[PDB]
Design an enzyme around this catalytic site. Structure first.
Site, PDB file in Angstrom:
ATOM      1  N   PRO A 189       0.732  -1.225   0.008  1.00 58.94           N
ATOM      2  CA  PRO A 189       0.003   0.117  -0.148  1.00 58.94           C
ATOM      3  C   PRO A 189       0.651   1.178  -0.017  1.00 58.94           C
ATOM      4  O   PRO A 189       0.394   2.317  -0.195  1.00 58.94           O
ATOM      5  CB  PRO A 189      -0.953  -0.095   1.384  1.00 58.94           C
ATOM      6  CG  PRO A 189      -0.253  -1.280   2.032  1.00 58.94           C
ATOM      7  CD  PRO A 189       0.686  -1.940   1.272  1.00 58.94           C
TER       8      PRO A 189
ATOM      9  N   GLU B 237       3.287  -8.031   8.772  1.00 59.58           N
ATOM     10  CA  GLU B 237       3.369  -6.591   8.559  1.00 59.58           C
ATOM     11  C   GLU B 237       4.193  -6.266   7.395  1.00 59.58           C
ATOM     12  O   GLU B 237       4.342  -4.952   7.186  1.00 59.58           O
ATOM     13  CB  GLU B 237       3.900  -5.861  10.104  1.00 59.58           C
ATOM     14  CG  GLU B 237       2.997  -6.155  10.984  1.00 59.58           C
ATOM     15  CD  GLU B 237       1.585  -5.692  11.125  1.00 59.58           C
ATOM     16  OE1 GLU B 237       1.234  -4.994   9.854  1.00 59.58           O
ATOM     17  OE2 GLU B 237       1.101  -4.932  11.988  1.00 59.58           O
TER      18      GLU B 237
ATOM     19  N   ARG C 168      -5.200  -8.673 -19.811  1.00 59.93           N
ATOM     20  CA  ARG C 168      -6.438  -8.248 -20.777  1.00 59.93           C
ATOM     21  C   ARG C 168      -5.743  -7.635 -21.958  1.00 59.93           C
ATOM     22  O   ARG C 168      -6.429  -7.328 -22.975  1.00 59.93           O
ATOM     23  CB  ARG C 168      -7.182  -7.126 -20.167  1.00 59.93           C
ATOM     24  CG  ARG C 168      -8.198  -7.968 -18.848  1.00 59.93           C
ATOM     25  CD  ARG C 168      -9.137  -6.813 -18.203  1.00 59.93           C
ATOM     26  NE  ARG C 168     -10.419  -6.762 -19.081  1.00 59.93           N
ATOM     27  CZ  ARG C 168     -10.285  -5.196 -19.821  1.00 59.93           C
ATOM     28  NH1 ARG C 168      -9.166  -4.480 -19.520  1.00 59.93           N
ATOM     29  NH2 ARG C 168     -11.387  -5.049 -20.831  1.00 59.93           N
TER      30      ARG C 168
ATOM     31  N   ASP D  67     -14.096   0.322 -22.818  1.00 57.41           N
ATOM     32  CA  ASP D  67     -14.130   0.083 -20.951  1.00 57.41           C
ATOM     33  C   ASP D  67     -13.963   1.381 -20.347  1.00 57.41           C
ATOM     34  O   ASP D  67     -13.521   2.303 -20.857  1.00 57.41           O
ATOM     35  CB  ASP D  67     -12.808  -0.947 -20.825  1.00 57.41           C
ATOM     36  CG  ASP D  67     -13.063  -2.127 -20.701  1.00 57.41           C
ATOM     37  OD1 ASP D  67     -14.380  -2.536 -20.730  1.00 57.41           O
ATOM     38  OD2 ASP D  67     -12.223  -3.153 -20.825  1.00 57.41           O
TER      39      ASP D  67
HETATM   40  N1  SFG Z   1      -3.228  -2.218  -1.110  1.00 57.96           N
HETATM   41  C1  SFG Z   1      -2.422  -2.978  -1.090  1.00 57.96           C
HETATM   42  N2  SFG Z   1      -1.807  -3.076  -2.306  1.00 57.96           N
HETATM   43  C2  SFG Z   1      -0.685  -3.803  -2.564  1.00 57.96           C
HETATM   44  N3  SFG Z   1      -0.347  -4.685  -1.479  1.00 57.96           N
HETATM   45  C3  SFG Z   1      -1.024  -4.797  -0.607  1.00 57.96           C
HETATM   46  C4  SFG Z   1      -1.914  -3.777  -0.008  1.00 57.96           C
HETATM   47  N4  SFG Z   1      -2.512  -3.915   1.334  1.00 57.96           N
HETATM   48  C5  SFG Z   1      -1.701  -4.945   1.616  1.00 57.96           C
HETATM   49  N5  SFG Z   1      -0.665  -5.450   0.711  1.00 57.96           N
HETATM   50  C6  SFG Z   1       0.021  -6.829   0.817  1.00 57.96           C
HETATM   51  O1  SFG Z   1      -0.071  -7.330   2.031  1.00 57.96           O
HETATM   52  C7  SFG Z   1       1.180  -7.488   2.870  1.00 57.96           C
HETATM   53  C8  SFG Z   1       0.720  -7.778   4.356  1.00 57.96           C
HETATM   54  C9  SFG Z   1       0.238  -6.184   4.942  1.00 57.96           C
HETATM   55  N6  SFG Z   1      -0.657  -6.668   6.049  1.00 57.96           N
HETATM   56  C10 SFG Z   1       1.265  -5.391   5.264  1.00 57.96           C
HETATM   57  C11 SFG Z   1       0.814  -3.849   5.479  1.00 57.96           C
HETATM   58  C12 SFG Z   1       1.609  -2.774   5.793  1.00 57.96           C
HETATM   59  N7  SFG Z   1       1.848  -3.137   7.649  1.00 57.96           N
HETATM   60  C13 SFG Z   1       1.456  -1.262   5.528  1.00 57.96           C
HETATM   61  O2  SFG Z   1       0.411  -0.973   6.318  1.00 57.96           O
HETATM   62  O3  SFG Z   1       1.803  -1.130   4.586  1.00 57.96           O
HETATM   63  C14 SFG Z   1       2.096  -6.146   2.246  1.00 57.96           C
HETATM   64  O4  SFG Z   1       3.426  -6.610   2.633  1.00 57.96           O
HETATM   65  C15 SFG Z   1       1.658  -6.284   0.889  1.00 57.96           C
HETATM   66  O5  SFG Z   1       2.254  -7.089   0.348  1.00 57.96           O
HETATM   67  N1  SFG Z   2     -12.053  -2.077 -10.591  1.00 56.81           N
HETATM   68  C1  SFG Z   2     -13.102  -2.849 -10.456  1.00 56.81           C
HETATM   69  N2  SFG Z   2     -13.803  -2.938  -9.337  1.00 56.81           N
HETATM   70  C2  SFG Z   2     -14.911  -3.662  -9.048  1.00 56.81           C
HETATM   71  N3  SFG Z   2     -15.144  -4.604 -10.067  1.00 56.81           N
HETATM   72  C3  SFG Z   2     -14.548  -4.589 -11.250  1.00 56.81           C
HETATM   73  C4  SFG Z   2     -13.590  -3.696 -11.574  1.00 56.81           C
HETATM   74  N4  SFG Z   2     -13.093  -3.948 -12.672  1.00 56.81           N
HETATM   75  C5  SFG Z   2     -13.795  -4.937 -13.130  1.00 56.81           C
HETATM   76  N5  SFG Z   2     -14.666  -5.674 -12.096  1.00 56.81           N
HETATM   77  C6  SFG Z   2     -15.479  -6.421 -12.316  1.00 56.81           C
HETATM   78  O1  SFG Z   2     -15.533  -7.219 -13.483  1.00 56.81           O
HETATM   79  C7  SFG Z   2     -16.666  -7.557 -14.186  1.00 56.81           C
HETATM   80  C8  SFG Z   2     -16.457  -7.597 -15.853  1.00 56.81           C
HETATM   81  C9  SFG Z   2     -15.688  -6.363 -16.405  1.00 56.81           C
HETATM   82  N6  SFG Z   2     -14.912  -6.801 -17.519  1.00 56.81           N
HETATM   83  C10 SFG Z   2     -16.983  -5.230 -17.023  1.00 56.81           C
HETATM   84  C11 SFG Z   2     -16.194  -3.881 -17.137  1.00 56.81           C
HETATM   85  C12 SFG Z   2     -17.084  -2.840 -17.673  1.00 56.81           C
HETATM   86  N7  SFG Z   2     -17.052  -3.111 -19.116  1.00 56.81           N
HETATM   87  C13 SFG Z   2     -16.540  -1.389 -17.341  1.00 56.81           C
HETATM   88  O2  SFG Z   2     -15.628  -0.852 -18.198  1.00 56.81           O
HETATM   89  O3  SFG Z   2     -17.129  -0.769 -16.243  1.00 56.81           O
HETATM   90  C14 SFG Z   2     -17.493  -6.136 -13.972  1.00 56.81           C
HETATM   91  O4  SFG Z   2     -18.951  -6.467 -14.169  1.00 56.81           O
HETATM   92  C15 SFG Z   2     -17.214  -5.929 -12.459  1.00 56.81           C
HETATM   93  O5  SFG Z   2     -18.069  -6.751 -11.606  1.00 56.81           O
END
Ligand code: SFG
Ligand code: SFG
Lengths: 240, 240
Positions: free
Chosen positions: B91, B118, B156, B163
Site C-alpha cells: 500500500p 506486517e 487483458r 471500457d
Molecule cells: N493495498 C495494497 N496493495 C498492494 N499490496 C498490499 C496492499 N495491502 C496489503 N498488501 C500486501 O499485504 C502485505 C501484508 C500487509 N498486512 C502489510 C501492511 C503494512 N503494514 C502497511 O500498512 O503498509 C503487504 O506486505 C503487501 O504485500
Molecule cells: N475495478 C473494479 N472494481 C470492481 N469490480 C470490477 C473492477 N473491474 C472489473 N470489475 C468487475 O469485472 C466485471 C467484468 C468487467 N470486465 C466489466 C467492465 C465494464 N465494461 C466497465 O468497463 O465498467 C465487472 O462487471 C465488475 O464486476
C-alpha cells in the site's frame, strides 16, 4: 463478532483463495467470517446452462444473462434475510479506500455481486443493487478479485481475526534480522530499547514517507502538534 | 504475444483463482500467460520451516523472515533471466490505475513479491525490488490478491486473451433481454438499429456518468469537440 458475506459468482471456487488460506482462511474455519456462494449457472434452465446474453445496440462483448443472475440474487437475499446490503463490484462504483472499508465493516451482512464479461444489465443495478463499489481505477475480467479484496479488507476489522491509512499515513519501514544486510544496517534507534525514541522515529518516518510519496494524503489530515513538529524536522533534513 | 509472471508467495495455491478460471485461466491453458510460483517456505532450513521473524524495535506484528524470502526472490530472478522487473505489492507503492496497467503490460516478464504479516524488511526493498505498486488506499492481509489483480488487469492486454478508463471515461450502461424488466424499458435508441445514434448515445452516457460520479476524472481529459458537445447536452438535460 461475526460477519456474513453472500457472494453471487460464476466462479465460486475462486473464493478458496480467501476461505482456505492465511488469516482470512482461519477466520472462516473459526466461524468469525462466513462466506456463502450462489452461482447463476445453477439457476439456468436451458440444456447448455447459458449465463451470458447479447447487448441491445450491438457492438462487441456479452453481458451476464438477466434471469439466472436475478434468480441467484433473490436466493441470496432470502438467505441473508433482513438488513443485508447488496453491493455490485464495478469500476463505475465508489472507489474503495480505508474510510470506505471502515464503513463497510459496520455491516453484519453483505451480499457481493460479481460481474463477468462486459457486466450486468443496468436495470438490475437499479432494481437489486444498493451500492456500487470499485477497488480502483482499472478494469479487471471479473468481480471476484474485487469481492475478495473487499472481504479481506473488512475481515481485518473482525475481532479475533488478527497500518498504512490507519491514521491517514503510510506505514513506517520495518526491519528484522540480520542486523546488517548487504552492508545496510538497521537504524540504531530501533536496537536502542528506548520505546519513546522508537515511537517518535516510526511516526517521523511515516510522515516523511507520506510527504515524499503521497503528499496529497497529507493535505486531508489535521496533524497533531507532535506530527507537525516531526514532519517539519523530516522536511528540514531532506533539504539539508 | 506472451507474458511471463514469476510470483513469490507463502500461499501459491491462491493463484488458482486466476490460473484455473475464466478468461485468465484460458490464457494460462493456452500458454499466452505463464505464471510460475516460488514459496519462501521451501527455502527454509529449520525443522519447523519458519517464515516469519520479529521486528527490531518491538511493537506488535511479525515480518517475513529475510533469508527464505531473499532466497526465493533470487531463484525467481534466475528463472526470469534478463530484463525482468521485480515488483513488491504494497500500500506504500504507486497506486495502480489504467495508465499504470498499460505501462506494466509493456513488460514481457515480471516478478511479483507478495508480502504477508506486517510486510518485508525495508532493506530487501532497497536491494531486490525495482518498483513498489499498490492496488489501492486500503490494507489487505497479503500481497496475493493485489498480485492477482495486477496480473488480471495486464493479461487483458495480451493479444488473444479477450471500457471504463480506456478513453478516460466510465463505461456506458448496458442492456440485454428482456425488453422490459420490472417496468424499466431498454432505451429505444438501442433497439433502433441506428449505429451512429447508438454510438453517440453511449458516448454521451459515458460523459454524463463520469461527470456525475467522478468529475475529477473529467478534468484530466482533453475532450474532442464531439465529446464537449455531448457533455454540454447532458449537463443541460440534467439541469432542465
Ligand atoms: N493495498 C495494497 N496493495 C498492494 N499490496 C498490499 C496492499 N495491502 C496489503 N498488501 C500486501 O499485504 C502485505 C501484508 C500487509 N498486512 C502489510 C501492511 C503494512 N503494514 C502497511 O500498512 O503498509 C503487504 O506486505 C503487501 O504485500
Ligand atoms: N475495478 C473494479 N472494481 C470492481 N469490480 C470490477 C473492477 N473491474 C472489473 N470489475 C468487475 O469485472 C466485471 C467484468 C468487467 N470486465 C466489466 C467492465 C465494464 N465494461 C466497465 O468497463 O465498467 C465487472 O462487471 C465488475 O464486476
Amino acid at each position: 463478532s461475526h460477519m456474513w458475506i453472500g457472494v453471487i459468482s460464476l466462479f465460486p471456487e475462486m473464493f478458496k483463495a480467501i476461505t482456505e488460506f492465511g488469516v482470512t482462511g482461519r477466520a472462516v474455519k473459526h466461524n468469525l467470517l462466513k462466506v456463502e456462494c450462489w452461482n447463476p449457472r445453477d439457476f439456468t434452465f436451458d440444456k447448455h446452462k447459458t449465463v451470458d446474453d447479447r447487448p441491445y445496440g450491438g457492438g462487441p462483448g456479452m453481458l451476464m444473462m438477466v434471469q439466472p443472475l436475478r434468480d441467484a440474487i433473490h436466493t441470496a437475499k432470502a438467505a441473508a434475510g433482513e438488513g443485508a446490503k447488496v453491493i455490485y463490484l464495478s469500476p463505475q462504483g465508489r472507489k474503495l479506500d480505508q474510510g470506505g472499508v471502515t464503513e463497510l465493516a459496520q455491516n453484519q451482512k453483505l451480499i457481493l455481486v460479481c460481474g463477468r464479461y462486459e457486466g450486468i444489465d443496468e436495470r438490475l443495478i437499479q432494481t437489486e443493487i444498493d451500492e456500487e463499489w470499485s477497488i480502483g481505477d482499472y478494469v479487471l475480467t471479473g468481480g471476484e478479485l474485487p469481492a475478495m479484496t473487499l472481504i479481506d479488507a473488512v475481515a481485518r476489522f473482525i475481532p479475533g481475526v488478527l497500518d498504512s491509512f490507519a491514521d491517514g499515513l503510510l506505514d513506517c519501514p520495518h526491519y528484522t534480522r540480520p542486523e546488517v544486510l548487504e552492508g545496510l544496517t538497521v537504524p540504531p534507534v530501533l536496537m536502542s530499547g528506548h520505546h519513546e525514541e522508537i515511537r517518535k522515529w516510526r511516526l517521523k518516518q511515516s510522515l516523511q514517507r507520506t510527504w515524499l510519496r503521497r503528499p496529497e494524503l497529507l493535505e486531508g489530515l489535521a496533524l497533531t502538534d507532535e506530527q507537525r513538529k516531526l514532519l517539519k524536522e523530516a522536511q528540514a533534513e531532506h533539504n539539508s
